[PDB]
Design a protein around this nucleic acid. Structure first.
Lengths: 129, 129, 129, 129, 129
RNA sequence: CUAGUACCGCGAGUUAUCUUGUGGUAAUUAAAAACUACCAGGAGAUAACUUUAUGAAGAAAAGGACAAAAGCCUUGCUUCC
């Protein structure tokens, strides 16, 4: 039951969503479409840039029930860019799906968030046996 | 019990742990292997430096309960460097054990931390009778 | 038991012990008291340096050995420094055994003295669960 | 009873005592030994400077005590210098004995502490009748 | 049952092992991967430098092992370099296997180790009849 | 008192972090009086680099004599620093 956003800046190359209850949080997606001559063939390349921004209150040190004592907000941001030829969209979606698993198995379930990299983490590619 | 730290940076020359609860707490172990020349014999020397760091906020003058403002924190650092030939590790451990007791006599049980030195403390060497 | 040392050089800040039978073995403790001031608080910082020195003969020809080979000697040293304010000394002692515990589980039980590092070793915090 | 101090800095001339509970409380003694000649005979004069320092917090309460209003300390210093040849040390102790009573009359029992001189106060000499 | 080693230092392109009992013994594996351009047949090349180092004491005089006399150890080194395209690795393994056969002919079975070269020994090709 | 005895010092620079806090930049103030935002900056603690004490090591490419070279030298790079 997440709060849905509404578009704010609608443009042929950029749309920004923001939450009515919390105007601070945003999610903006921008596309840059380009035509590429990779070799003896002309191809249409697209680079979609998706960024989600959230301003959250700081840790709120313990034993501080007082309401109007207010801390500043840090910067929780996530940026993603997807670059690939349009005709290879079907196989590109496989890349996006497996990219999520690699990040999740390394950061979500792993400890990459705290700042530690696990060389023995098991990550796999899109290609299957 | 105690919350176990988890490594944040790992390297064959140094490893740094940190408390996931608070990142200020730190315990870093570093090594410096060295090949040391003695009389017609070559011996492998290892010098391991171990540092434990804690940020403790103020002494918090008692009487009144703490108002919710952060106290500037001081550094409580314990640094330990152990140097010796690798092959004499068996006897160096005994030297480490008696070293712990000697410091405990001066500091854990004495008033060394307050800045006082007792020239009558009982100090026992690694060699036994 | 172990042979006690007697004080050698009683200085304003440094006292050095030494075994009467073996003058090579020493245990010197030096104190440095500093006047440090933090936010609206006056602190007495104490940095205690403790050095344990032992000169150990070489591994001694393996296989066997007589009682007249007398190999050269090599330096075994252990230095620890304890830095912090005396105002919160009682809690400063808390990480001392924790620092003792962390090094023991990493160097005594482990093989860090040889030159190895164990990124998966159990390192526990001073604070309690 | 009274909490004893421990020596801090030891020197051939000066030794400083400080209280473990209150590091600021201080009793320092410094001696300057010198040879002087008056009746074509050398005399070994000893000058002993004794200083006692305490930091009494000024009378903070004004009806209101409160948990943690902390207002600064004041200087309470007592310095005594004892001079005279060690040859007449036996009678010089009696001089110290008399000096104590004379000061006690003016200050300990009288109102010299308030800042008043009593001309008719009873003052007696070391020499007895 | 040969003694197993564990890695000493890790690097992006270098791993070394050493025996805990004897730190002198080492085994270094270093890789160098580089992009090789060919006649419009792109290839990936690797260069593996494998070094085995042993410090062995010089041979004691014949007919006497009793006397625990230590000769200064000498350096024994075996270094191997493998270069080739990763695509042709499968047949390159046969190259390595054949290389062993030729060396064993001169070195192990033969006496090329003593400094004597035999232009008669059978040297077989990698490919089969 | 002064051959000695004995006594004294332990530190460089740059950068960042924390604490203290000298001035300046403007505000309320007739005001750089004093609180505030920034900088410079005296001081104490910590971290990184050149280099100090005193620095030391790790070859793998190049040139130097030479066959374009390696082995004899240094430099690229790194380590506590």
């Amino acid at each position: 039951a997440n709060k849905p956003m509404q578009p704010i800046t609608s443009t042929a190359n950029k749309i920004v969503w923001s939450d009515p209850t919390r105007l601070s949080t945003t999610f903006s997606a921008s596309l840059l479409r380009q035509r590429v001559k990779v070799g003896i063939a002309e191809l249409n390349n697209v680079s979609g840039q998706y960024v989600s921004v959230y301003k959250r209150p700081a840790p709120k040190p313990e034993g501080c029930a007082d309401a109007c004592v207010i801390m500043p907000n840090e910067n929780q941001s996530i940026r993603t860019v997807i670059s690939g030829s349009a005709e290879n969209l079907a196989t590109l979606k496989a890349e996006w799906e497996t990219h999520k698993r690699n990040v999740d198995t390394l950061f979500a379930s792993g400890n990459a968030g705290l700042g530690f990299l696990d060389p023995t983490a098991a990550i796999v590619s899109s290609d299957t046996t």
